[PDB]
Amino acid sequence: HIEGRHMDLTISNELTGEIYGPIEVSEDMALTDLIALLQADCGFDKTKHDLYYNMDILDSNRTQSLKELGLKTDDLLLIRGKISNS
């Protein structure tokens, strides 16, 4: 029911099964800044892990805004590993 330039995006760790909060972020937030938050809270590391949306990779070098990625308050973002043992 709530609409606006601030949206709640849910984060989940495909590696561990952990479910992080819907974090209140803005359409105007850069992709790089979203990852900057994920580094602090989710312990994300762009060298060991990748951020996924629509099951494809969001390159950590994209300086685009969440708005340009088409993200909304109903979206799920996944943390998936770059390295796998099997």
XYZ file of N, CA, C and O in Angstrom:
344
model
N 0.796 -1.269 0.000
C 0.000 0.000 0.000
C 0.807 1.287 0.000
O 0.322 2.359 -0.258
N 2.081 1.156 0.377
C 2.970 2.307 0.489
C 3.747 2.437 -0.809
O 4.347 1.478 -1.275
N 3.720 3.628 -1.384
C 4.425 3.907 -2.629
C 5.319 5.123 -2.408
O 4.995 5.992 -1.592
N 6.424 5.219 -3.133
C 7.292 6.377 -3.004
C 8.669 6.147 -3.586
O 8.955 5.090 -4.120
N 9.531 7.150 -3.458
C 10.917 7.057 -3.948
C 11.812 6.245 -3.009
O 12.998 6.052 -3.279
N 11.245 5.824 -1.886
C 11.941 4.998 -0.898
C 11.188 3.680 -0.982
O 9.965 3.693 -1.094
N 11.921 2.585 -1.062
C 11.366 1.275 -1.342
C 12.093 0.268 -0.481
O 13.238 0.492 -0.091
N 11.428 -0.826 -0.167
C 11.972 -1.835 0.729
C 12.404 -3.032 -0.103
O 11.584 -3.707 -0.707
N 13.703 -3.264 -0.171
C 14.242 -4.352 -0.999
C 14.758 -5.432 -0.092
O 15.523 -5.180 0.825
N 14.313 -6.637 -0.358
C 14.627 -7.766 0.506
C 15.877 -8.457 0.007
O 16.053 -8.663 -1.193
N 16.768 -8.770 0.934
C 18.060 -9.366 0.605
C 18.104 -10.782 1.159
O 17.715 -11.016 2.299
N 18.583 -11.732 0.380
C 18.702 -13.110 0.857
C 19.986 -13.767 0.387
O 20.447 -13.540 -0.734
N 20.594 -14.562 1.249
C 21.872 -15.192 0.945
C 21.669 -16.594 0.409
O 21.423 -17.523 1.157
N 21.832 -16.731 -0.896
C 21.695 -18.016 -1.590
C 22.701 -19.054 -1.064
O 22.512 -20.247 -1.180
N 23.773 -18.558 -0.461
C 24.832 -19.411 0.062
C 24.510 -20.063 1.400
O 24.990 -21.149 1.698
N 23.812 -19.328 2.250
C 23.617 -19.735 3.645
C 22.161 -19.966 4.012
O 21.856 -20.553 5.038
N 21.264 -19.456 3.184
C 19.841 -19.525 3.475
C 19.397 -18.397 4.399
O 18.239 -18.356 4.800
N 20.302 -17.493 4.732
C 19.969 -16.362 5.600
C 19.073 -15.393 4.867
O 19.201 -15.175 3.656
N 18.192 -14.764 5.626
C 17.248 -13.787 5.092
C 17.483 -12.486 5.835
O 17.270 -12.398 7.041
N 17.954 -11.483 5.115
C 18.208 -10.171 5.682
C 16.939 -9.355 5.500
O 15.971 -9.804 4.872
N 16.907 -8.172 6.088
C 15.684 -7.402 6.127
C 15.307 -6.774 4.825
O 16.188 -6.485 4.009
N 14.015 -6.478 4.623
C 13.825 -5.485 3.574
C 14.423 -4.187 4.074
O 14.030 -3.640 5.110
N 15.438 -3.743 3.370
C 16.161 -2.540 3.736
C 15.580 -1.367 2.971
O 15.282 -1.468 1.780
N 15.392 -0.266 3.677
C 14.739 0.899 3.100
C 15.765 1.730 2.314
O 16.619 2.432 2.863
N 15.683 1.612 1.004
C 16.630 2.237 0.089
C 15.867 3.077 -0.905
O 14.653 3.005 -0.976
N 16.561 3.917 -1.650
C 15.896 4.808 -2.595
C 16.165 4.422 -4.032
O 17.195 3.850 -4.347
N 15.259 4.815 -4.915
C 15.423 4.624 -6.359
C 16.681 5.370 -6.829
O 17.317 5.007 -7.817
N 17.019 6.418 -6.092
C 18.114 7.332 -6.419
C 19.435 6.848 -5.839
O 20.474 7.471 -6.010
N 19.395 5.736 -5.124
C 20.605 5.176 -4.546
C 21.380 4.536 -5.683
O 20.795 3.904 -6.573
N 22.687 4.717 -5.691
C 23.497 4.115 -6.732
C 23.631 2.630 -6.428
O 23.589 2.210 -5.275
N 23.854 1.837 -7.465
C 24.098 0.407 -7.311
C 25.329 0.219 -6.445
O 25.379 -0.650 -5.583
N 26.322 1.061 -6.671
C 27.557 0.981 -5.926
C 27.327 1.273 -4.441
O 27.976 0.677 -3.586
N 26.398 2.167 -4.139
C 26.105 2.531 -2.750
C 25.258 1.468 -2.079
O 25.421 1.204 -0.894
N 24.386 0.819 -2.844
C 23.625 -0.304 -2.305
C 24.623 -1.374 -1.868
O 24.553 -1.890 -0.763
N 25.594 -1.665 -2.720
C 26.605 -2.662 -2.385
C 27.437 -2.190 -1.208
O 27.816 -2.984 -0.362
N 27.708 -0.903 -1.127
C 28.459 -0.359 0.007
C 27.742 -0.671 1.340
O 28.383 -1.030 2.321
N 26.416 -0.595 1.358
C 25.643 -0.971 2.545
C 25.749 -2.471 2.781
O 25.931 -2.916 3.907
N 25.648 -3.251 1.713
C 25.706 -4.710 1.822
C 27.058 -5.171 2.352
O 27.143 -6.181 3.030
N 28.109 -4.413 2.080
C 29.431 -4.721 2.623
C 29.448 -4.598 4.145
O 30.114 -5.370 4.825
N 28.738 -3.610 4.668
C 28.709 -3.366 6.105
C 27.768 -4.327 6.848
O 28.116 -4.832 7.905
N 26.562 -4.508 6.324
C 25.530 -5.277 7.034
C 25.543 -6.767 6.657
O 25.636 -7.641 7.504
N 25.491 -7.041 5.363
C 25.468 -8.425 4.883
C 26.861 -9.047 4.748
O 26.989 -10.217 4.372
N 27.896 -8.256 5.001
C 29.264 -8.745 4.879
C 29.632 -9.064 3.448
O 30.486 -9.914 3.181
N 28.964 -8.419 2.507
C 29.181 -8.690 1.094
C 30.588 -8.292 0.659
O 31.101 -7.249 1.041
N 31.186 -9.098 -0.201
C 32.483 -8.764 -0.777
C 32.406 -9.030 -2.264
O 32.238 -10.165 -2.687
N 32.543 -7.976 -3.055
C 32.451 -8.068 -4.517
C 33.532 -8.936 -5.149
O 33.431 -9.299 -6.317
N 34.550 -9.299 -4.386
C 35.593 -10.188 -4.891
C 35.303 -11.664 -4.653
O 35.920 -12.532 -5.267
N 34.393 -11.958 -3.734
C 34.085 -13.348 -3.348
C 32.651 -13.705 -3.706
O 32.278 -14.875 -3.798
N 31.851 -12.672 -3.864
C 30.410 -12.816 -4.073
C 29.919 -11.833 -5.121
O 30.599 -10.856 -5.433
N 28.727 -12.098 -5.629
C 28.060 -11.252 -6.613
C 26.656 -10.980 -6.120
O 26.066 -11.802 -5.405
N 26.120 -9.840 -6.518
C 24.750 -9.468 -6.201
C 23.919 -9.846 -7.421
O 24.316 -9.544 -8.554
N 22.820 -10.542 -7.196
C 21.972 -11.018 -8.278
C 20.601 -10.376 -8.228
O 20.004 -10.236 -7.158
N 20.075 -10.072 -9.403
C 18.709 -9.570 -9.561
C 18.188 -10.218 -10.823
O 18.931 -10.345 -11.786
N 16.938 -10.678 -10.788
C 16.319 -11.401 -11.911
C 17.179 -12.606 -12.321
O 17.194 -13.019 -13.461
N 17.886 -13.142 -11.328
C 18.790 -14.296 -11.475
C 19.983 -14.054 -12.407
O 20.669 -15.002 -12.790
N 20.277 -12.792 -12.697
C 21.456 -12.406 -13.469
C 22.356 -11.542 -12.568
O 21.940 -11.129 -11.487
N 23.591 -11.321 -12.991
C 24.600 -10.639 -12.175
C 24.530 -9.116 -12.312
O 24.640 -8.552 -13.412
N 24.433 -8.435 -11.177
C 24.558 -6.987 -11.154
C 26.035 -6.669 -10.943
O 26.564 -6.786 -9.835
N 26.706 -6.289 -12.024
C 28.128 -5.957 -11.970
C 28.369 -4.857 -10.957
O 27.751 -3.797 -11.020
N 29.311 -5.080 -10.053
C 29.620 -4.110 -8.995
C 30.270 -2.832 -9.523
O 30.600 -1.939 -8.750
N 30.515 -2.778 -10.826
C 31.119 -1.612 -11.455
C 30.056 -0.708 -12.098
O 30.382 0.331 -12.670
N 28.787 -1.098 -12.035
C 27.723 -0.278 -12.621
C 27.460 0.893 -11.700
O 27.123 0.712 -10.558
N 27.602 2.095 -12.218
C 27.401 3.317 -11.442
C 25.970 3.808 -11.629
O 25.676 4.978 -11.417
N 25.100 2.909 -12.077
C 23.710 3.250 -12.350
C 22.943 3.307 -11.034
O 23.401 2.790 -10.024
N 21.761 3.894 -11.070
C 20.895 4.016 -9.905
C 19.964 2.822 -9.866
O 19.737 2.196 -10.900
N 19.384 2.522 -8.712
C 18.460 1.382 -8.590
C 17.248 1.573 -9.497
O 16.718 0.616 -10.063
N 16.896 2.831 -9.730
C 15.863 3.225 -10.671
C 16.106 2.716 -12.087
O 15.182 2.318 -12.781
N 17.359 2.753 -12.516
C 17.730 2.357 -13.876
C 17.740 0.844 -14.013
O 17.611 0.309 -15.105
N 17.903 0.161 -12.889
C 17.904 -1.299 -12.881
C 16.461 -1.805 -12.873
O 16.189 -2.977 -13.108
N 15.543 -0.879 -12.618
C 14.119 -1.186 -12.617
C 13.616 -1.757 -11.313
O 12.557 -2.374 -11.274
N 14.395 -1.581 -10.251
C 14.064 -2.162 -8.943
C 12.904 -1.450 -8.253
O 12.755 -0.233 -8.352
N 12.096 -2.228 -7.548
C 10.941 -1.723 -6.799
C 10.882 -2.361 -5.408
O 11.618 -3.279 -5.114
N 9.951 -1.882 -4.588
C 9.745 -2.350 -3.199
C 9.202 -3.780 -3.051
O 8.783 -4.195 -1.974
N 9.164 -4.500 -4.151
C 8.568 -5.839 -4.209
C 9.618 -6.806 -4.745
O 9.324 -7.935 -5.114
N 10.846 -6.314 -4.843
C 11.937 -7.118 -5.422
C 12.808 -7.825 -4.396
O 13.053 -7.331 -3.291
N 13.323 -8.969 -4.819
C 14.225 -9.788 -4.016
C 15.601 -9.798 -4.672
O 15.737 -10.039 -5.877
N 16.618 -9.530 -3.867
C 18.002 -9.518 -4.320
C 18.692 -10.698 -3.665
O 18.465 -10.995 -2.491
N 19.546 -11.379 -4.414
C 20.241 -12.559 -3.907
C 21.743 -12.348 -3.821
O 22.356 -11.736 -4.696
N 22.345 -12.909 -2.786
C 23.791 -12.884 -2.609
C 24.279 -14.265 -2.995
O 23.896 -15.250 -2.360
N 25.080 -14.359 -4.044
C 25.525 -15.657 -4.554
C 27.043 -15.645 -4.697
O 27.646 -14.602 -4.905
N 27.671 -16.796 -4.507
C 29.113 -16.875 -4.506
C 29.731 -16.948 -5.882
O 29.226 -17.594 -6.791
N 30.879 -16.311 -5.992
C 31.697 -16.341 -7.218
C 32.504 -17.625 -7.270
O 32.922 -18.082 -8.330
N 32.786 -18.155 -6.093
C 33.653 -19.317 -5.936
C 32.789 -20.434 -5.369
O 31.974 -20.195 -4.487
N 32.955 -21.649 -5.869
C 32.203 -22.800 -5.381
C 33.145 -23.990 -5.327
O 34.038 -24.103 -6.149
N 32.945 -24.865 -4.351
C 33.813 -26.036 -4.181
C 33.340 -27.197 -5.051
O 34.092 -28.108 -5.390
N 32.042 -27.207 -5.356
C 31.398 -28.283 -6.121
C 30.191 -27.763 -6.887
O 29.523 -26.811 -6.537
